Enzyme design. Structure first.
Site, short mmCIF file in Angstrom:
data_model
loop_
_atom_site.label_atom_id
_atom_site.label_comp_id
_atom_site.label_asym_id
_atom_site.label_seq_id
_atom_site.Cartn_x
_atom_site.Cartn_y
_atom_site.Cartn_z
CD1 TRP A 136 -8.05 -0.53 3.28
CD2 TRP A 136 -9.49 -1.28 4.82
NE1 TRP A 136 -7.94 0.27 4.38
CE2 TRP A 136 -8.81 -0.16 5.34
CE3 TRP A 136 -10.45 -1.92 5.61
CZ2 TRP A 136 -9.06 0.33 6.62
CZ3 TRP A 136 -10.70 -1.43 6.88
CH2 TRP A 136 -10.01 -0.32 7.37
CB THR B 139 1.38 1.96 6.69
OG1 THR B 139 0.02 2.21 6.33
CG2 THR B 139 1.71 2.71 7.97
CB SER C 32 -0.93 0.01 1.21
OG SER C 32 -0.83 -1.19 1.96
CB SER D 157 -4.49 1.96 3.10
OG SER D 157 -3.33 1.54 2.43
CE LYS E 242 -3.67 1.56 -1.58
NZ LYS E 242 -4.23 0.68 -0.50
CD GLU F 13 -5.79 -7.89 -9.39
OE1 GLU F 13 -5.69 -6.65 -9.27
OE2 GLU F 13 -6.89 -8.47 -9.55
CG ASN G 59 -7.15 -1.25 -1.49
OD1 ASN G 59 -6.00 -0.91 -1.76
ND2 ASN G 59 -7.43 -2.08 -0.50
CB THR H 157 -0.16 -4.08 5.54
OG1 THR H 157 0.22 -3.02 6.41
CG2 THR H 157 -0.10 -5.40 6.30
C1 SFR Z 1 -5.11 -4.80 1.18
C2 SFR Z 1 -5.28 -4.14 2.54
O1 SFR Z 1 -5.24 -5.13 3.52
C3 SFR Z 1 -4.18 -3.08 2.80
C4 SFR Z 1 -4.10 -2.15 1.55
O2 SFR Z 1 -5.17 -1.55 1.27
O3 SFR Z 1 -3.06 -2.00 0.85
C5 SFR Z 1 -4.52 -2.22 3.92
N1 SFR Z 1 -3.51 -1.14 4.01
C6 SFR Z 1 -2.71 -1.30 5.00
C7 SFR Z 1 -1.62 -0.29 5.30
O4 SFR Z 1 -0.71 -0.64 6.09
O5 SFR Z 1 -1.62 0.85 4.80
C8 SFR Z 1 -3.37 -2.01 6.19
C9 SFR Z 1 -3.78 -1.16 7.41
C10 SFR Z 1 -4.80 -0.09 6.97
C11 SFR Z 1 -5.74 0.02 7.88
C12 SFR Z 1 -5.43 -1.09 9.01
O6 SFR Z 1 -4.50 -1.95 8.36
S1 SFR Z 1 -4.57 -3.11 5.41
#
Ligand code: SFR
Length: 268
Positions: A82, A212, A47, A107, A50, A145, A109, A214
């Site tokens: 998300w 962040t 992520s 984050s 972004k 993906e 999507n 993840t």
């Molecule tokens: C595919 C998704 O699981 C993931 C994403 O959208 O890329 C989310 N983003 C991240 C991050 O680290 O930016 C997590 C954080 C966001 C909110 C709590 O977990 S989950």
């Protein structure tokens, strides 16, 4: 290379305990001192792309006036798992600026994919990164993906050093015009997803903007940040992790610990 050698053994112990690979690059923008550990290895962006996506939107807004306030309408088929903000505006639409803030701070999507479309897809974001001098960054796929984090796969990766260098150019350097630069900083400062990563490593009085990432697989997670010690020059840093097995879990505590070691190596 002196500061890097200072924390080389503690970084190796941290990643041994984690059971994977940790990549760190940190730059003191006042003194120019740097700390590196696997800083030139590729890690999945997840992520964290972004943040750079929002910067690319701001760069475009310098040429296309009124871009940020443009309303974007979307259907249910634009929603991606998300999408915590954009789902609340499905029946109304959102502006480009609101989508950008949602992508950075939550984050989101669906927002990220909508903005990727406005930029010409993953190649359009990669092109923006090339335009600021980043030859390492590559985005290849869309959400979700791009989160596959396959060992050895260079798609949707960058290096901690390139992430830090690009972040510095965009938040502190001249890659964006002054109004857009402060907007990018303000969005990063408002991020809600990073309280347990780099933010957990810094004193309570320091200002922080971060993004962040993840991936959800292969122990793969990350964070990059600009941090401002009170009354001093900012530090820019990136912490990326990955691990060999698909079921390996990421660790926010390891990211925070690596950030602490980087700051300690820099002497703060
Ligand atoms: C595919 C998704 O699981 C993931 C994403 O959208 O890329 C989310 N983003 C991240 C991050 O680290 O930016 C997590 C954080 C966001 C909110 C709590 O977990 S989950």
């Amino acid at each position: 290379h002196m500061l890097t050698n200072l924390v080389a053994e503690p970084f190796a112990k941290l990643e041994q305990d984690f059971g994977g690979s940790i990549g760190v690059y940190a730059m003191d923008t006042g003194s120019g001192a740097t700390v590196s550990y696997r800083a030139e290895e590729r890690f999945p962006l997840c992520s964290s792309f972004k943040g750079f996506l929002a910067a690319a939107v701001l760069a475009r807004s310098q040429q296309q006036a009124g871009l940020l306030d443009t309303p974007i309408r979307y259907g249910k088929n634009a929603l991606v798992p998300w999408s915590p903000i954009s789902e609340k505006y499905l029946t109304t639409g959102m502006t480009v600026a609101e989508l950008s803030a949602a992508a950075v701070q939550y984050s989101d999507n669906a927002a990220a994919n909508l903005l990727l479309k406005e930029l010409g897809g993953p190649a359009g974001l990669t092109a923006f990164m090339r335009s600021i001098g980043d030859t390492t960054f590559r985005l290849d796929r869309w959400e979700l993906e791009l989160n596959s984090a396959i060992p050895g796969d260079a798609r949707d990766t960058s290096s901690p050093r390139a992430v830090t260098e690009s972040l510095q150019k965009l938040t502190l350097g001249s890659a964006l015009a002054a109004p857009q630069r402060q907007q990018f900083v303000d969005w990063l400062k408002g991020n809600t997803t990073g309280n347990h990563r780099i933010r957990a490593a810094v004193p309570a009085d320091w200002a922080v903007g971060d993004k962040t990432g993840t991936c959800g697989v292969y122990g793969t997670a990350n964070d990059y940040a600009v941090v401002w010690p009170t009354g001093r020059a900012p530090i820019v840093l990136a912490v990326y992790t990955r691990a060999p097995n698909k079921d390996d879990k990421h660790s926010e505590a390891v990211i925070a610990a690596a950030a602490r070691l980087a700051l300690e190596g820099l002497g703060v």
